[PDB]
Amino acid sequence: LGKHNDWIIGKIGNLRTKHMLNPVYNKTIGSVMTATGIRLEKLPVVRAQTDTTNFHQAIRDKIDKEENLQTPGLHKKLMEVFNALKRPELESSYDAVEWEELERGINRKGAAGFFERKNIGEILDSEKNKVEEIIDNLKKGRNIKYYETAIPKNEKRDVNDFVDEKKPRVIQYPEAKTRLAITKVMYKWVKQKPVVIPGYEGKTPLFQIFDKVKKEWDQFQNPVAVSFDTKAWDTQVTTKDLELIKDIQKYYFKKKWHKFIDTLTMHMTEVPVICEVYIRKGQRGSGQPDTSAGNSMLNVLTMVYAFCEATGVPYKSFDRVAKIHVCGDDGFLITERALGEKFASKGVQILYEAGKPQKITEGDKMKVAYQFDDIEFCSHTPIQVRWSDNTSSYMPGRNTTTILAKMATRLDSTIAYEKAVAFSFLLMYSWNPLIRRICLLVLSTELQVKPGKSTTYYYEGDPISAYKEVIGHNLFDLKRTSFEKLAKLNLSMSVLGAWTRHTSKRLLQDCVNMGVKEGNWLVNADRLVSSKTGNRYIPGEGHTLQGRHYEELVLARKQINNFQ
C-alpha cells in the first residue's frame, strides 16, 4: 500500500482473495397485461439482486485479477491516436462549473458511501462547504482518504447520479462528497459538454440513434458493422490505462487543474475498496464519474488503434474510412467490407495484446453485421417502420419479453407514474404492436390524472401530440413494421410461454371494444384499431419533457431559463 492508502489499516479477514489484499408490479400496467392473457410470472425478472456468498463469489471471480500485461509503450500510440481526434480549439478551455449549473438535473438520493449519512441532496443543502475543502485538498496535491464502496447489483444503493442493465454484478462507487467534488470540476469532461469523444452516443436519445447511424451507413459501396465486445471491461482497465485517461483530461482542462487531476488519478490507481476490505489492482469502478467518459474515450482509442493497426490505415485517416459509436465499452464501427473483415480477424489478436480481451463467439473473429439492422448496440437493435407517407425510418428495437418485463415492474420501498411510463415506452417501442396498444391503453385510463416526473420522459398536454413532435411522424402514420425483424424479437415470448395465440388479438379487441364507442378516443391513433372502428383521434397540443420542466424536441433539447 502507498502512503496514501495507509489509513485503512487503523480503521480495520475472510475474503480468500488470490490477487488483491484482504486485511413490485405496476398495478395498472400489470392489470392491463393480465386481462389480455399475458402471464406476468413467465416474464423475466429484470432487477435481480445478488447475495452475500455470491456477491463475494462474484468478486473473486471477476475483480480479483492482475493488471493484464500490455504491449510496450502502447499508450504512446494511443496518445498519437488522440492527437488525430483532439479538439484543438478547446485546448486549456475547461474550468469548474458553478454550484447552480451542477444541481441542475442531479439525483437528490445519490448513492451514500460507506461512511456518509447524507445522500447527494443532503450534502448539497448544508455540507456544500465540505465539497470545496476536498477540491482544495486535491487542486494543490493533498492525499485525502480515497475509498470506493462496493455493493452487489440492483441493490437499494445502486443509485445513478439500457444504462441500468449495462452495469456489472459488482458496483464500485466512492463517496457522495468526492463524487460531487470531481464533477463540480470535471463536469465538462464527465458529461461531455461538448462531445470531444467521437462517436460517443451517451447524449443521443434512443429514438434518434438508429436513424442517425443508417444515414452514415448509406454512404458506403458495401458497408459492414464490426462489434466491440470486450469481457468485463471494468476489470480490464489498468494503471497504465488510467494515466493516459489522466492525460486526455490534462489537455482539455485549464492549467489550474492538472494538480487536481494527477492527485485524483494516483488515488484511483490503487483503490482500497469497502464492501469486507480489499485493495484493488487498478481497474474501473461502476459508480465513478469517469465511467462513461473514461471508458468511451479509452475504448475508441483502443478500437481506433486496433482497426488502424490491423487494416494498415494510419491513425489520422480513420475519420474518413470508418465511423465509431461507443457507449461505455459496448460500441460498433461501420466501414467498407474489405476493411471490416480484416479488422474482425486481426483485431481479436491485437485487442488481447492491448489488455482488452474480446469475447470471440464465431470462430476467433469479431461479430460483424452485414445487413444494417443486424447491429446490436447498448441493449437495442434497429427495426424499420414504414410510414403512410411512403418513407421509412428506424426505431430502437428489443425483444418484447425484456420490454414487457422492464415496464410491468418497478422497484420501491401510483397511477400518474404509470401514465408517464406508458408514454416513455411508446416513444421508444411504438414499432411493437403489443406495446403500442398496451401503452395507449394505460394512457386511456383516468384521463383526468396527468403524468409524473420520476420516469425518463413525460408529456404535458396530449401524448399523441407529444409523439408527433419528437418522432417526426404520427402514431396513426405507422402503417407496417418490419416483418422479419419484429418476429425475431417476439419469438422469445413464445419460447418463455408468456403469451397465447389469442393475446395478439385479445388485446386488439379491448382497444376496438373502446374505440368503436362514440367519442374521441386514444386507441384510434392505432391505424389498425381506427380502420376496424371507423372512429379516429383528432389530437390536441402536447409536448414531451423530463425533470422538473425541460423540453425534448425532434433533434434538440430546449430547457427553461424563463425564471432561471
Coordinates of C-alpha atoms in Angstrom, one line a residue:
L1 CA 0.0 0.0 0.0
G2 CA 1.1 3.5 -0.8
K3 CA 1.5 6.2 1.9
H4 CA -1.9 7.5 0.8
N5 CA -3.7 4.1 1.4
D6 CA -2.3 3.5 4.9
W7 CA -5.4 5.0 6.5
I8 CA -7.5 1.8 6.2
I9 CA -5.0 -0.1 8.5
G10 CA -6.2 1.9 11.5
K11 CA -9.9 1.7 10.7
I12 CA -9.8 -2.2 10.5
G13 CA -10.4 -11.2 7.2
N14 CA -12.3 -13.8 5.2
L15 CA -12.2 -12.8 1.5
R16 CA -10.0 -15.7 0.2
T17 CA -8.6 -13.2 -2.3
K18 CA -5.9 -14.5 -4.7
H19 CA -4.7 -11.3 -6.3
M20 CA -5.7 -8.4 -4.1
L21 CA -5.2 -7.6 -0.4
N22 CA -7.8 -8.7 2.2
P23 CA -6.7 -7.2 5.6
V24 CA -43.3 -5.0 -7.0
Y25 CA -45.5 -4.7 -10.1
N26 CA -47.1 -1.6 -11.7
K27 CA -50.7 -2.2 -10.7
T28 CA -52.4 -0.6 -13.8
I29 CA -49.9 -1.7 -16.5
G30 CA -49.9 -5.1 -14.8
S31 CA -53.6 -5.4 -14.8
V32 CA -53.8 -4.4 -18.5
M33 CA -51.4 -7.2 -19.5
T34 CA -53.1 -9.7 -17.1
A35 CA -56.6 -9.1 -18.6
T36 CA -55.1 -9.8 -22.1
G37 CA -53.8 -13.2 -21.0
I38 CA -50.2 -12.3 -20.6
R39 CA -48.6 -14.3 -17.8
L40 CA -46.7 -11.8 -15.7
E41 CA -44.9 -14.6 -13.9
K42 CA -43.4 -16.3 -17.0
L43 CA -41.8 -12.9 -17.8
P44 CA -38.1 -12.4 -16.9
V45 CA -37.3 -10.7 -13.6
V46 CA -35.5 -7.5 -14.6
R47 CA -33.9 -6.1 -11.5
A48 CA -32.3 -9.1 -9.9
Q49 CA -30.4 -8.9 -6.6
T50 CA -27.1 -10.6 -5.6
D51 CA -26.5 -12.4 -2.3
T52 CA -23.6 -12.2 0.2
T53 CA -22.0 -15.6 -0.6
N54 CA -22.1 -14.9 -4.4
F55 CA -21.6 -11.2 -4.3
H56 CA -18.4 -12.5 -2.7
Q57 CA -18.1 -15.4 -5.1
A58 CA -18.5 -12.9 -8.0
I59 CA -15.9 -10.5 -6.7
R60 CA -13.1 -13.1 -6.6
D61 CA -14.5 -14.3 -10.0
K62 CA -14.0 -11.0 -11.8
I63 CA -12.3 -8.2 -9.9
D64 CA -9.6 -10.4 -8.3
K65 CA -7.1 -10.2 -11.2
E66 CA -3.7 -8.6 -12.1
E67 CA -3.3 -5.7 -14.5
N68 CA -3.4 -7.5 -17.8
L69 CA 0.0 -7.4 -19.4
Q70 CA 0.0 -4.8 -22.2
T71 CA 2.1 -4.2 -25.4
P72 CA 5.1 -1.9 -24.7
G73 CA 4.6 1.9 -24.8
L74 CA 1.2 1.3 -26.4
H75 CA -0.2 4.5 -24.8
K76 CA 2.4 6.3 -26.8
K77 CA 0.4 5.1 -29.9
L78 CA -3.0 5.6 -28.1
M79 CA -1.9 9.2 -27.4
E80 CA -0.8 9.5 -31.1
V81 CA -4.3 8.3 -31.9
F82 CA -5.7 11.1 -29.5
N83 CA -3.6 13.6 -31.4
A84 CA -5.7 12.9 -34.5
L85 CA -9.0 13.3 -32.7
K86 CA -8.4 16.2 -30.3
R87 CA -10.4 19.4 -30.4
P88 CA -7.6 22.0 -30.7
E89 CA -9.9 25.0 -30.4
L90 CA -10.7 23.9 -26.8
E91 CA -7.2 23.3 -25.5
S92 CA -6.9 24.5 -21.9
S93 CA -10.6 25.6 -22.1
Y94 CA -12.4 23.6 -19.4
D95 CA -13.0 25.1 -16.0
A96 CA -15.0 24.1 -13.0
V97 CA -18.8 24.7 -13.1
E98 CA -20.7 26.8 -10.5
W99 CA -22.9 25.2 -7.9
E100 CA -26.1 26.4 -9.8
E101 CA -25.2 24.5 -13.1
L102 CA -24.3 21.4 -11.0
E103 CA -27.5 20.8 -9.1
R104 CA -29.3 21.2 -12.5
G105 CA -30.5 17.6 -13.1
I106 CA -28.9 15.6 -10.3
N107 CA -30.2 12.5 -8.3
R108 CA -31.0 14.0 -4.8
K109 CA -30.9 10.4 -3.5
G110 CA -27.4 9.8 -4.8
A111 CA -25.6 6.7 -3.5
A112 CA -24.4 7.1 0.1
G113 CA -20.8 6.0 0.6
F114 CA -19.9 3.6 3.4
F115 CA -19.1 6.5 5.7
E116 CA -21.6 9.2 4.6
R117 CA -25.1 9.7 6.0
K118 CA -26.1 12.4 3.5
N119 CA -27.2 11.3 0.0
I120 CA -26.3 13.9 -2.7
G121 CA -29.4 16.0 -2.0
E122 CA -28.5 16.4 1.7
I123 CA -24.9 17.5 1.2
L124 CA -26.0 20.0 -1.5
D125 CA -28.0 21.7 1.2
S126 CA -25.7 22.1 4.3
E127 CA -22.4 20.4 3.5
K128 CA -21.6 22.3 0.3
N129 CA -18.5 23.6 2.2
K130 CA -17.5 20.0 2.8
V131 CA -17.2 19.7 -1.0
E132 CA -14.7 22.6 -1.5
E133 CA -12.1 21.6 1.0
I134 CA -11.9 18.3 -0.9
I135 CA -11.4 20.3 -4.1
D136 CA -8.8 22.4 -2.4
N137 CA -7.2 19.3 -0.9
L138 CA -6.9 17.9 -4.4
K139 CA -6.3 21.0 -6.6
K140 CA -2.9 21.6 -4.9
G141 CA -2.0 18.0 -4.2
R142 CA -3.1 16.7 -0.8
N143 CA -3.6 12.9 -0.1
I144 CA -7.2 12.6 1.1
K145 CA -8.8 9.2 2.0
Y146 CA -10.0 7.8 -1.4
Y147 CA -12.3 4.8 -0.9
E148 CA -14.8 3.0 -3.1
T149 CA -17.9 1.4 -1.6
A150 CA -18.6 -2.0 -3.2
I151 CA -22.2 -3.4 -3.4
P152 CA -24.0 -6.1 -5.5
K153 CA -26.2 -5.5 -8.4
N154 CA -29.6 -3.6 -8.4
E155 CA -29.4 -3.3 -4.6
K156 CA -31.0 -0.2 -3.0
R157 CA -27.8 1.9 -3.2
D158 CA -27.4 1.1 -6.8
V159 CA -28.3 4.8 -7.5
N160 CA -27.1 6.5 -10.6
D161 CA -26.3 10.2 -10.2
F162 CA -30.2 0.2 -21.2
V163 CA -27.8 2.0 -18.8
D164 CA -29.1 0.2 -15.7
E165 CA -28.6 -3.2 -17.3
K166 CA -25.2 -2.1 -18.7
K167 CA -23.7 -2.3 -15.1
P168 CA -21.6 -5.2 -13.7
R169 CA -22.5 -7.5 -10.8
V170 CA -20.1 -5.5 -8.5
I171 CA -20.9 -1.8 -8.1
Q172 CA -17.9 0.3 -7.0
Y173 CA -18.5 3.9 -6.1
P174 CA -16.7 6.5 -4.0
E175 CA -18.2 8.9 -1.5
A176 CA -21.0 11.2 -2.5
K177 CA -18.8 14.1 -1.3
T178 CA -15.9 13.1 -3.6
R179 CA -18.3 12.2 -6.4
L180 CA -19.6 15.8 -6.3
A181 CA -16.1 17.3 -6.0
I182 CA -14.8 15.5 -9.1
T183 CA -18.0 16.5 -11.0
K184 CA -18.0 20.2 -9.9
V185 CA -14.6 20.5 -11.6
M186 CA -14.8 18.0 -14.4
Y187 CA -18.5 18.2 -15.5
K188 CA -17.3 19.4 -19.0
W189 CA -15.5 16.1 -19.3
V190 CA -17.6 13.7 -17.3
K191 CA -20.8 15.0 -19.0
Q192 CA -19.2 15.6 -22.5
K193 CA -20.3 19.2 -23.0
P194 CA -19.2 19.4 -25.7
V195 CA -18.7 15.9 -27.2
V196 CA -15.0 15.5 -27.5
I197 CA -15.1 11.7 -27.5
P198 CA -16.1 10.9 -31.1
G199 CA -19.0 8.5 -31.8
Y200 CA -19.9 8.9 -28.1
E201 CA -23.7 8.2 -28.1
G202 CA -24.3 9.0 -24.4
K203 CA -26.0 12.2 -25.4
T204 CA -28.0 10.8 -28.3
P205 CA -31.5 9.8 -27.2
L206 CA -32.7 6.3 -28.2
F207 CA -35.4 7.1 -30.7
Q208 CA -32.9 9.1 -32.7
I209 CA -29.9 6.8 -32.5
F210 CA -30.7 4.3 -35.2
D211 CA -32.0 6.7 -37.8
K212 CA -28.7 8.6 -37.2
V213 CA -26.4 5.6 -37.9
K214 CA -28.2 4.4 -41.1
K215 CA -27.6 7.8 -42.6
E216 CA -23.8 7.2 -42.2
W217 CA -24.4 3.6 -43.3
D218 CA -25.9 4.6 -46.7
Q219 CA -22.6 6.2 -47.9
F220 CA -20.6 3.1 -48.4
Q221 CA -20.3 1.0 -51.6
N222 CA -20.7 -2.1 -49.3
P223 CA -20.9 -1.3 -45.5
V224 CA -20.3 -3.6 -42.5
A225 CA -20.5 -3.1 -38.7
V226 CA -17.8 -4.9 -36.6
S227 CA -18.8 -5.2 -33.0
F228 CA -16.8 -4.2 -29.9
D229 CA -17.3 -7.0 -27.3
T230 CA -14.7 -6.9 -24.5
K231 CA -15.0 -9.2 -21.4
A232 CA -15.7 -7.3 -18.1
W233 CA -14.1 -4.0 -19.4
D234 CA -14.2 -2.6 -15.9
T235 CA -11.6 -5.1 -14.6
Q236 CA -9.6 -4.8 -17.9
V237 CA -8.6 -1.2 -17.1
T238 CA -5.0 -0.9 -15.8
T239 CA -2.8 1.7 -14.0
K240 CA -1.1 2.5 -17.4
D241 CA -4.7 2.8 -18.9
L242 CA -5.9 5.4 -16.3
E243 CA -2.8 7.6 -16.6
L244 CA -3.5 8.0 -20.4
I245 CA -7.1 8.9 -19.5
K246 CA -5.5 11.2 -16.9
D247 CA -3.5 13.0 -19.7
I248 CA -6.5 13.4 -22.0
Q249 CA -8.1 15.3 -19.2
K250 CA -4.9 17.4 -18.6
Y251 CA -5.1 18.5 -22.3
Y252 CA -8.5 20.0 -22.4
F253 CA -8.6 21.5 -18.9
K254 CA -7.1 24.8 -17.9
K255 CA -3.7 24.9 -16.3
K256 CA -5.0 25.3 -12.8
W257 CA -6.4 21.7 -12.6
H258 CA -3.5 19.4 -13.7
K259 CA -2.8 19.2 -10.0
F260 CA -6.4 18.3 -9.2
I261 CA -6.3 15.6 -11.9
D262 CA -3.0 13.9 -11.0
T263 CA -3.8 13.7 -7.3
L264 CA -7.2 12.0 -8.1
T265 CA -5.5 9.8 -10.7
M266 CA -2.8 8.3 -8.4
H267 CA -5.6 7.9 -5.8
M268 CA -7.6 5.9 -8.4
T269 CA -4.8 3.6 -9.5
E270 CA -4.7 1.8 -6.1
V271 CA -8.1 2.0 -4.5
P272 CA -8.9 0.5 -1.1
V273 CA -12.4 -0.8 -1.7
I274 CA -15.0 -1.3 1.1
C275 CA -18.0 -3.8 0.8
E276 CA -15.2 -6.6 3.8
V277 CA -11.9 -4.9 2.9
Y278 CA -9.9 -5.5 -0.3
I279 CA -7.4 -3.4 -2.2
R280 CA -7.8 -3.2 -6.0
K281 CA -5.2 -3.5 -8.7
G282 CA -6.2 -0.6 -10.8
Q283 CA -9.5 -1.2 -12.8
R284 CA -12.6 0.9 -13.1
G285 CA -15.4 1.1 -10.7
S286 CA -19.0 1.4 -11.8
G287 CA -20.0 4.5 -9.8
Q288 CA -17.0 6.6 -10.6
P289 CA -17.9 9.8 -12.5
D290 CA -15.3 8.8 -15.1
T291 CA -17.1 5.5 -16.1
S292 CA -18.9 6.8 -19.3
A293 CA -16.4 9.4 -20.5
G294 CA -13.3 7.3 -19.4
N295 CA -14.4 4.0 -21.0
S296 CA -15.9 5.7 -24.0
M297 CA -12.6 7.6 -24.5
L298 CA -10.4 4.7 -23.6
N299 CA -12.5 2.5 -25.9
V300 CA -12.4 4.4 -29.2
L301 CA -8.6 5.0 -28.6
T302 CA -8.1 1.2 -28.3
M303 CA -10.6 0.5 -31.0
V304 CA -9.3 3.1 -33.5
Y305 CA -5.8 1.9 -32.7
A306 CA -6.5 -1.7 -33.4
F307 CA -8.6 -1.0 -36.5
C308 CA -5.7 1.1 -37.8
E309 CA -3.1 -1.4 -36.8
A310 CA -4.9 -4.4 -38.5
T311 CA -6.2 -2.7 -41.6
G312 CA -3.0 -0.7 -42.1
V313 CA -4.9 2.6 -42.1
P314 CA -2.9 5.2 -40.1
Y315 CA -4.4 7.0 -37.1
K316 CA -5.1 10.4 -38.6
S317 CA -7.1 9.0 -41.6
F318 CA -9.5 6.8 -39.6
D319 CA -12.2 9.6 -39.6
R320 CA -12.8 9.0 -43.3
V321 CA -12.9 5.2 -43.7
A322 CA -14.8 4.3 -40.6
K323 CA -17.5 5.7 -38.2
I324 CA -17.2 4.7 -34.5
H325 CA -20.1 4.7 -32.0
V326 CA -19.4 3.8 -28.3
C327 CA -21.4 4.0 -25.1
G328 CA -19.1 2.9 -22.3
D329 CA -17.5 -0.4 -23.6
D330 CA -20.3 -1.6 -25.9
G331 CA -19.9 0.0 -29.3
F332 CA -19.5 -0.6 -33.1
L333 CA -17.7 0.8 -36.1
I334 CA -19.0 1.0 -39.7
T335 CA -16.7 0.7 -42.7
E336 CA -16.4 -0.8 -46.1
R337 CA -16.4 -4.6 -46.5
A338 CA -12.7 -5.4 -47.0
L339 CA -11.8 -3.2 -44.1
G340 CA -14.4 -4.7 -41.8
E341 CA -13.4 -8.3 -42.4
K342 CA -9.7 -7.5 -41.9
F343 CA -10.4 -5.8 -38.6
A344 CA -12.5 -8.7 -37.3
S345 CA -9.8 -11.3 -37.8
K346 CA -6.6 -9.4 -37.0
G347 CA -8.4 -7.3 -34.3
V348 CA -9.1 -10.2 -31.9
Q349 CA -5.4 -10.9 -31.5
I350 CA -4.5 -7.2 -31.2
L351 CA -7.2 -6.4 -28.7
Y352 CA -6.0 -9.2 -26.5
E353 CA -2.4 -8.0 -26.5
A354 CA -3.7 -4.4 -25.8
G355 CA -5.2 -5.6 -22.5
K356 CA -8.8 -5.6 -23.7
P357 CA -9.6 -9.2 -24.5
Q358 CA -12.6 -9.8 -26.7
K359 CA -15.3 -12.4 -26.3
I360 CA -15.0 -14.1 -29.8
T361 CA -18.1 -16.1 -30.4
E362 CA -17.9 -17.1 -34.1
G363 CA -14.5 -18.7 -34.9
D364 CA -11.9 -16.4 -33.4
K365 CA -13.4 -13.5 -35.3
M366 CA -15.4 -10.4 -34.1
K367 CA -19.1 -10.3 -34.6
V368 CA -19.8 -8.5 -37.9
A369 CA -23.2 -7.3 -39.1
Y370 CA -23.6 -7.4 -42.9
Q371 CA -27.1 -6.1 -43.1
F372 CA -27.8 -2.8 -41.5
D373 CA -30.4 -4.0 -39.0
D374 CA -28.1 -6.7 -37.6
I375 CA -26.4 -4.3 -35.3
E376 CA -26.8 -4.5 -31.6
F377 CA -25.8 -1.5 -29.6
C378 CA -26.4 -0.7 -25.9
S379 CA -29.2 -3.3 -25.5
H380 CA -31.2 -2.4 -28.6
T381 CA -31.2 -3.4 -32.3
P382 CA -32.5 -1.4 -35.3
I383 CA -36.0 -2.1 -36.7
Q384 CA -37.5 -0.4 -39.7
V385 CA -41.1 1.0 -39.6
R386 CA -42.9 2.0 -42.9
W387 CA -44.9 5.3 -42.8
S388 CA -48.1 6.2 -44.6
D389 CA -46.0 8.9 -46.5
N390 CA -44.1 6.1 -48.3
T391 CA -40.9 6.9 -46.4
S392 CA -39.1 4.5 -44.0
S393 CA -37.4 5.2 -40.6
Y394 CA -35.8 3.2 -37.8
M395 CA -36.7 2.7 -34.2
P396 CA -34.9 1.3 -31.1
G397 CA -35.6 -2.5 -31.2
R398 CA -35.6 -5.0 -28.4
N399 CA -37.2 -8.4 -27.5
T400 CA -40.9 -7.9 -26.4
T401 CA -40.0 -10.1 -23.3
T402 CA -37.5 -7.7 -21.8
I403 CA -39.7 -4.7 -22.7
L404 CA -42.8 -6.1 -21.0
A405 CA -40.7 -7.1 -18.1
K406 CA -39.0 -3.7 -17.6
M407 CA -42.3 -1.9 -17.9
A408 CA -44.7 -4.0 -15.8
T409 CA -42.2 -3.7 -12.9
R410 CA -40.7 -1.0 -10.7
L411 CA -38.5 -1.1 -7.5
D412 CA -39.9 0.5 -4.4
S413 CA -39.7 0.7 -0.6
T414 CA -49.2 5.4 -8.2
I415 CA -51.1 5.8 -11.4
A416 CA -49.8 9.1 -12.5
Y417 CA -46.3 7.5 -12.7
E418 CA -47.7 4.6 -14.8
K419 CA -49.1 7.1 -17.4
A420 CA -45.6 8.6 -17.8
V421 CA -44.1 5.1 -18.1
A422 CA -46.6 4.2 -20.8
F423 CA -45.5 7.4 -22.7
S424 CA -41.7 6.9 -22.4
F425 CA -42.0 3.4 -23.8
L426 CA -44.4 4.4 -26.5
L427 CA -41.8 7.0 -27.6
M428 CA -39.3 4.2 -28.0
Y429 CA -41.1 1.0 -28.9
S430 CA -44.1 2.1 -30.9
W431 CA -42.9 -0.4 -33.6
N432 CA -44.1 -3.2 -31.2
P433 CA -47.8 -3.6 -31.8
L434 CA -48.3 -5.3 -28.5
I435 CA -46.6 -2.4 -26.6
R436 CA -48.1 0.5 -28.6
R437 CA -51.6 -0.8 -27.7
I438 CA -50.6 -1.5 -24.0
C439 CA -49.1 2.0 -23.9
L440 CA -52.2 3.6 -25.4
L441 CA -54.4 1.5 -23.0
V442 CA -52.7 2.8 -19.9
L443 CA -52.8 6.3 -21.4
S444 CA -56.6 5.8 -21.8
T445 CA -57.1 5.3 -18.0
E446 CA -58.1 8.2 -15.8
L447 CA -57.7 10.9 -18.5
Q448 CA -58.2 13.3 -15.6
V449 CA -54.9 12.3 -13.9
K450 CA -51.8 13.8 -15.5
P451 CA -48.2 12.3 -15.7
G452 CA -45.4 12.3 -13.1
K453 CA -41.7 13.1 -13.5
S454 CA -40.0 10.2 -11.7
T455 CA -39.6 8.3 -15.1
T456 CA -37.3 9.3 -18.1
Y457 CA -39.8 11.2 -20.3
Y458 CA -43.2 12.6 -19.8
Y459 CA -45.7 14.6 -21.7
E460 CA -47.7 17.7 -20.9
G461 CA -50.8 18.2 -22.9
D462 CA -51.8 15.4 -25.2
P463 CA -49.5 12.5 -25.6
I464 CA -50.2 11.7 -29.3
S465 CA -49.2 15.3 -30.0
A466 CA -46.1 14.8 -27.8
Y467 CA -45.2 11.8 -30.1
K468 CA -45.6 13.6 -33.4
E469 CA -43.3 16.3 -32.2
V470 CA -40.3 14.0 -31.4
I471 CA -40.6 11.1 -33.9
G472 CA -41.4 13.5 -36.7
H473 CA -44.4 11.4 -37.9
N474 CA -47.7 10.5 -36.3
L475 CA -48.7 7.2 -34.5
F476 CA -51.5 6.9 -36.9
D477 CA -49.0 7.0 -39.7
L478 CA -47.1 3.8 -38.7
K479 CA -48.6 1.5 -41.3
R480 CA -46.4 -1.7 -41.3
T481 CA -43.5 -2.5 -39.1
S482 CA -40.6 -4.7 -40.4
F483 CA -42.0 -8.2 -40.6
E484 CA -38.9 -10.4 -40.2
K485 CA -37.3 -8.3 -37.5
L486 CA -40.5 -8.0 -35.4
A487 CA -41.0 -11.7 -35.3
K488 CA -37.4 -12.4 -34.1
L489 CA -37.9 -10.1 -31.2
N490 CA -41.4 -11.6 -30.4
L491 CA -40.1 -15.2 -30.7
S492 CA -38.9 -15.2 -27.1
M493 CA -42.5 -14.6 -25.9
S494 CA -43.5 -17.9 -27.4
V495 CA -40.3 -19.7 -26.1
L496 CA -40.8 -18.5 -22.5
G497 CA -44.6 -19.1 -22.7
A498 CA -45.7 -15.6 -21.7
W499 CA -48.4 -15.0 -24.3
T500 CA -51.2 -17.1 -26.0
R501 CA -52.3 -17.3 -29.7
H502 CA -55.1 -15.1 -28.6
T503 CA -53.0 -12.4 -27.0
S504 CA -52.1 -10.5 -30.2
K505 CA -55.9 -10.5 -30.8
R506 CA -57.3 -10.4 -27.3
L507 CA -55.6 -7.1 -26.9
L508 CA -56.8 -5.7 -30.2
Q509 CA -60.3 -6.4 -29.2
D510 CA -60.1 -4.4 -25.9
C511 CA -58.8 -1.4 -28.0
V512 CA -61.6 -1.7 -30.5
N513 CA -64.1 -2.5 -27.7
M514 CA -63.1 1.0 -26.7
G515 CA -62.6 2.9 -30.0
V516 CA -65.9 1.9 -31.6
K517 CA -67.8 3.6 -28.7
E518 CA -68.8 7.2 -29.8
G519 CA -66.4 9.9 -28.9
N520 CA -62.7 10.9 -29.5
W521 CA -60.6 8.0 -28.2
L522 CA -56.9 7.4 -27.7
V523 CA -56.8 3.9 -29.1
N524 CA -58.0 5.1 -32.5
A525 CA -54.5 6.5 -33.0
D526 CA -53.5 2.9 -34.0
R527 CA -54.1 2.6 -37.7
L528 CA -55.5 -1.0 -37.4
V529 CA -57.8 0.0 -34.5
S530 CA -59.1 3.1 -36.3
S531 CA -59.9 1.2 -39.6
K532 CA -61.6 -1.5 -37.5
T533 CA -63.6 1.1 -35.6
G534 CA -64.2 3.9 -38.1
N535 CA -63.7 6.4 -35.3
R536 CA -60.4 8.5 -35.3
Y537 CA -58.3 10.6 -33.0
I538 CA -58.1 14.4 -33.6
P539 CA -55.2 15.2 -31.3
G540 CA -54.7 18.4 -29.4
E541 CA -51.5 20.1 -28.3
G542 CA -48.9 18.3 -26.3
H543 CA -45.1 18.3 -25.8
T544 CA -42.6 15.7 -24.3
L545 CA -40.3 16.7 -21.5
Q546 CA -38.4 15.5 -18.4
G547 CA -37.0 16.5 -14.9
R548 CA -38.7 19.5 -13.1
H549 CA -39.6 21.1 -16.5
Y550 CA -37.2 20.9 -19.6
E551 CA -38.3 20.1 -23.2
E552 CA -37.5 17.3 -25.7
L553 CA -38.0 18.1 -29.4
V554 CA -37.2 16.3 -32.7
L555 CA -33.4 16.9 -32.7
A556 CA -33.0 19.4 -29.8
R557 CA -33.3 19.6 -26.0
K558 CA -34.5 23.2 -25.1
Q559 CA -34.8 24.0 -21.4
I560 CA -36.5 26.8 -19.5
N561 CA -34.5 29.9 -18.4
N562 CA -37.7 32.0 -18.2
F563 CA -37.1 32.0 -14.4
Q564 CA -33.5 30.8 -14.3

